[PDB]
Amino acid sequence: INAELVTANLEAFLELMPEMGERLRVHRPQSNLVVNEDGDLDVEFRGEFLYGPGGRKRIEDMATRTALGPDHRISAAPLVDLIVKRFLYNILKRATDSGLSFLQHPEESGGFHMVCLGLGLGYQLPILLEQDNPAGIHIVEPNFDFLYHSLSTVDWRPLLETRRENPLRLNIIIEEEPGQIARQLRSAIRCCCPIVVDWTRLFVAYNSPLLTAAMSEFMRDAQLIGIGLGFLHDEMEMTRASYKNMRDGRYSILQHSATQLHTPVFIVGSGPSIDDDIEVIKANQDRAVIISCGTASRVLLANGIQPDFQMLLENGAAPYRALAAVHEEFGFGSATLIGSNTVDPRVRDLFEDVVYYFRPALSSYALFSPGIEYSLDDSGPTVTNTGTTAALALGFRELYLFGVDLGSRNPAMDFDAVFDVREPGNFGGVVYSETIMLWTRDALGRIIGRYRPAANAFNCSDGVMIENTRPLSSQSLRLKSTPDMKAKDLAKVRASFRPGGEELFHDRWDREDWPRSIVTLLGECAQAMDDHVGDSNRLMLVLSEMLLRDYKQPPTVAQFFVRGTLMMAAMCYDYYVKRVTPADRKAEFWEIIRDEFHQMIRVMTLQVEWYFDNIEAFESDEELFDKVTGWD
Ligand SMILES: [Cl-]
Ligand SMILES: [Cl-]
């Protein structure tokens, strides 16, 4: 049926979405494409019809009727760093001063992304496309037969043609599991253009509990997809920390070990259940490696327990000041510090010896990492993750967790926030835990899982149950190790630390003119705004291509420096331009956006040049932060 259209569509898939095309070419559907009484094409299977009589008209009327209502749209309000704050404040102030105001919801159809939960035979598509003209089109269709039969009914070539320059603009997701649908949708938005989800059209093609739930999930998920890009000033701090950490002096670099060490390791967090296990840790410290995670050092040292390693994840003066207070009160003895390359440079002074690992997904990683083998996965979100992943990377396999509680044992309102969720406890029952602690818990289980079955992890903490660990009362702990074995295994660890000289610093730093790259990138974004002011989707496509595109090659230092700030600015103006009234004065607001976007890029340009000129001279993170903050 419609053989010319079928052939023409099959050709387009084979050309522009080949794997899907190949699958369509050999597919033998179980369902039947039939002409119903209304003369519309329909899908029959065991006497059941997808559309049934008047089904086409119903679905088409829904697409027509839902062009403007907020119920069938993502509505993400815009609240961010100081630069975007200034930008946003200015565009709004200039607009309101000029007599413009902002509707709660847009009065226009539009939005960058369109999400179809279900395709069916695609009767809705022509209408939705004409209304919104989306740049990103994401179709979820659990039943491959429907896509196959849609070759008879949809004009697929103009859709597939959008993949020519950028294949991420059209995604067809053939999945039946809610979990997979959710992951793929998130990934489709995230990879195409995560930041402008505002006013995304949502449409369910046919009735399905699966499709309905996926839409609800996506609506909750949509706001979070474009989060997490680092802001200019934080990237300045990360790179300054790393610069200072590697410039001078003795330090070493962490390296993954191919072989296993048999000395057990005790990973110690700051959970209060530690007081039950202090004596056991003390009685065994001679034959186990003690990894102290952040503030855990206080309780170990006050009880005469010497950490072998002290872990630090966080950047910033506050984590440093906490560590310094512990050093001042007890001293750190012979402990080696294992920290992220972005920890406060003054942390070095507190320790005889310092080893760095390279924390990924930051400007400091791209600029200073000598390679993937010197970084850690799942080193976050907290320092307990850092110690666990560091231990596994170094070769330790028998692990004991202490003070890794990540919650407290179970001991008509006005202020009604929920502070805690009930979770199964390591020693059974229930413990109350917060969201940050569950992420920490999940990262621990996940890293430990990647080293099983060689990894054997015991949790002696009276807190939450952690996957891939076995509960163990510290009274039942019996080790097979000796002090000699421990000394042997520390010698192996120590021998694996690659020393860091100035050679490494210069190799990394001198290979590119950093401020020049950044200023060049900024110039290209300014120019993009001038060339595409007024054309939301094209402008966003152009900025995304310049700033994101993480898959093809890793992000450059320049991209890490500016993408978070510029994309958040884009998110802000994109939200307000769709809502500006009077509608016939929209171009005036576009001019405001263009001009302020330039002023923002100018301020960023000057900050970058000033920052690189003085990167060495800043006495601390707080000096740097105070000065960019006070930028007049
Ligand atoms: Cl081995
Ligand atoms: Cl309980």
Side-chain angles (χ1 to χ4, degrees):
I1 295 165
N2 299 330
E4 295 179 2
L5 177 60
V6 172
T7 300
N9 289 332
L10 182 58
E11 290 167 345
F13 278 96
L14 288 163
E15 181 185 354
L16 296 151
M17 200 186 280
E19 284 179 16
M20 186 64 65
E22 189 49 45
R23 187 177 170 185
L24 285 164
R25 195 183 65 91
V26 298
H27 183 73
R28 301 295 309 284
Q30 292 168 326
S31 50
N32 296 309
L33 187 66
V34 306
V35 176
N36 73 2
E37 295 171 333
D38 306 329
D40 308 309
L41 286 171
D42 203 347
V43 183
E44 182 273 319
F45 180 60
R46 301 179 178 160
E48 295 178 342
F49 289 64
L50 172 55
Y51 295 103
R56 174 178 192 168
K57 181 181 180 177
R58 178 171 209 111
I59 199 60
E60 284 181 352
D61 286 343
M62 288 176 62
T64 298
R65 171 189 76 80
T66 53
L68 304 168
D71 291 359
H72 316 293
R73 297 279 183 172
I74 297 301
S75 302
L79 277 64
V80 179
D81 62 334
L82 305 172
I83 294 174
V84 174
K85 191 198 174 200
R86 191 79 210 178
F87 170 73
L88 177 57
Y89 182 91
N90 289 0
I91 69 176
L92 295 180
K93 175 188 168 49
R94 286 171 66 173
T96 59
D97 288 350
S98 75
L100 307 178
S101 61
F102 297 95
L103 302 166
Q104 191 198 347
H105 298 308
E107 267 174 10
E108 55 175 17
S109 278
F112 188 100
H113 297 281
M114 167 161 290
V115 178
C116 303
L117 303 138
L119 175 68
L121 291 179
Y123 294 130
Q124 66 281 2
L125 285 180
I127 298 165
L128 298 171
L129 295 172
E130 193 284 325
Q131 292 169 335
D132 296 319
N133 190 48
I137 302 175
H138 315 286
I139 301 170
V140 178
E141 177 49 85
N143 191 334
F144 192 78
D145 284 16
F146 297 169
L147 177 66
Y148 178 84
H149 294 309
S150 80
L151 297 190
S152 297
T153 48
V154 177
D155 194 344
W156 278 110
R157 177 164 281 276
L159 292 173
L160 288 156
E161 202 58 46
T162 60
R163 291 172 60 89
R164 188 173 295 285
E165 309 307 321
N166 186 352
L168 302 164
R169 290 178 52 186
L170 179 72
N171 294 283
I172 297 175
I173 295 159
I174 311 300
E175 297 296 333
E176 299 169 35
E177 297 162 319
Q180 270 300 313
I181 288 165
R183 285 201 156 83
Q184 299 270 82
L185 266 179
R186 289 198 292 265
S187 173
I189 299 296
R190 179 187 305 114
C191 289
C192 177
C193 196
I195 213 52
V196 291
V197 289
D198 177 67
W199 211 237
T200 294
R201 188 74 172 274
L202 304 172
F203 196 88
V204 170
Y206 51 87
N207 279 342
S208 165
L210 181 65
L211 295 181
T212 292
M215 178 165 126
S216 294
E217 183 168 5
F218 179 78
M219 292 178 81
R220 292 187 313 267
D221 285 350
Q223 295 178 329
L224 289 52
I225 294 170
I227 301 303
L229 299 172
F231 300 129
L232 180 60
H233 296 149
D234 299 315
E235 296 293 322
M236 287 177 166
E237 176 47 26
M238 295 302 93
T239 292
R240 181 202 73 85
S242 189
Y243 175 109
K244 301 294 288 185
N245 280 331
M246 289 172 67
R247 183 71 189 84
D248 303 278
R250 289 196 296 274
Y251 65 86
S252 299
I253 303 304
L254 186 152
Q255 197 161 214
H256 285 252
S257 176
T259 56
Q260 303 182 28
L261 305 171
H262 294 108
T263 304
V265 72
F266 293 173
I267 290 156
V268 187
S270 59
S273 76
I274 192 77
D275 75 333
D276 291 329
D277 313 311
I278 282 293
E279 290 311 317
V280 174
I281 296 170
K282 191 162 188 185
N284 285 277
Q285 74 178 307
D286 62 337
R287 66 189 161 285
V289 170
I290 308 305
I291 294 186
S292 178
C293 296
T295 53
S297 58
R298 182 173 285 288
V299 65
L300 299 168
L301 294 167
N303 290 277
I305 296 167
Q306 175 63 52
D308 295 288
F309 298 108
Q310 171 68 36
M311 311 295 307
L312 190 63
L313 175 64
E314 297 190 67
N315 162 263
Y320 160 74
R321 283 184 295 261
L323 266 182
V326 179
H327 177 73
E328 169 66 46
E329 182 169 355
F330 305 105
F332 274 99
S334 62
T336 288
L337 178 289
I338 299 178
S340 160
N341 59 308
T342 61
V343 301
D344 195 283
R346 296 169 288 186
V347 174
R348 188 134 89 216
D349 305 337
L350 310 173
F351 290 88
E352 283 164 8
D353 172 56
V354 181
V355 183
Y356 294 116
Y357 74 93
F358 290 84
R359 199 181 184 180
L362 296 167
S363 59
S364 48
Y365 183 80
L367 206 175
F368 289 116
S369 182
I372 193 67
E373 68 266 52
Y374 309 103
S375 52
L376 298 173
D377 291 333
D378 295 311
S379 67
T382 61
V383 64
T384 288
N385 299 109
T386 313
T388 301
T389 188
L392 293 161
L394 295 179
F396 298 102
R397 296 291 179 269
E398 193 184 330
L399 275 54
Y400 295 84
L401 311 177
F402 298 90
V404 185
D405 293 5
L406 310 179
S408 298
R409 175 63 69 185
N410 189 359
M413 192 155 289
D414 304 344
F415 307 90
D416 214 33
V418 175
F419 294 87
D420 285 318
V421 300
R422 295 167 65 95
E423 292 302 310
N426 185 52
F427 296 122
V430 158
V431 309
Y432 289 84
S433 185
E434 303 160 29
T435 295
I436 181 60
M437 299 196 278
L438 306 166
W439 301 336
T440 295
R441 177 198 71 186
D442 292 5
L444 287 176
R446 172 174 60 258
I447 195 66
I448 290 164
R450 296 176 62 193
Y451 290 85
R452 291 193 57 189
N456 194 36
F458 301 91
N459 187 4
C460 303
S461 311
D462 190 15
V464 299
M465 183 65 84
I466 304 167
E467 290 179 58
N468 295 307
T469 67
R470 264 204 299 281
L472 179 70
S473 163
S474 67
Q475 299 192 67
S476 295
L477 177 151
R478 296 294 182 284
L479 305 177
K480 299 163 185 151
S481 51
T482 67
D484 285 10
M485 187 185 301
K486 181 182 181 180
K488 184 180 177 73
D489 292 352
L490 288 175
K492 291 182 166 166
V493 164
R494 185 81 198 171
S496 71
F497 299 156
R498 187 188 140 180
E502 290 171 47
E503 293 81 6
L504 180 51
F505 170 81
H506 289 300
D507 179 62
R508 301 290 74 192
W509 190 249
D510 300 335
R511 78 184 194 281
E512 195 177 321
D513 184 346
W514 307 111
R516 191 177 163 171
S517 308
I518 296 162
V519 170
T520 293
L521 183 52
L522 288 174
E524 290 169 350
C525 300
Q527 185 61 40
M529 169 61 76
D530 283 347
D531 297 334
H532 302 291
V533 53
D535 190 339
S536 301
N537 292 353
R538 183 56 51 184
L539 176 53
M540 273 307 322
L541 286 163
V542 174
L543 290 174
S544 287
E545 173 176 18
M546 289 174 184
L547 299 174
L548 310 176
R549 185 181 65 81
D550 198 322
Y551 177 74
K552 285 177 179 287
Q553 290 179 344
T556 57
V557 167
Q559 283 171 323
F560 274 117
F561 260 72
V562 303
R563 67 191 192 169
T565 297
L566 300 182
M567 284 297 90
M568 291 304 286
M571 188 204 78
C572 292
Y573 69 71
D574 172 75
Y575 180 88
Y576 291 107
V577 291
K578 295 188 200 78
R579 291 173 176 74
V580 73
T581 57
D584 63 349
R585 293 180 64 200
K586 185 177 170 183
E588 296 173 32
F589 191 51
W590 264 119
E591 166 50 30
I592 286 171
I593 287 163
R594 189 199 60 73
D595 188 42
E596 292 295 341
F597 191 80
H598 265 258
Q599 279 179 35
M600 189 182 73
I601 281 173
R602 174 168 191 279
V603 166
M604 292 178 78
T605 290
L606 292 165
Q607 282 191 355
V608 162
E609 289 172 355
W610 168 83
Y611 162 82
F612 279 98
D613 282 341
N614 298 129
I615 190 164
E616 204 162 73
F618 298 114
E619 293 164 346
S620 82
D621 64 328
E622 290 174 329
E623 185 199 317
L624 171 54
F625 191 74
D626 280 358
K627 294 183 175 191
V628 296
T629 291
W631 196 275
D632 275 23

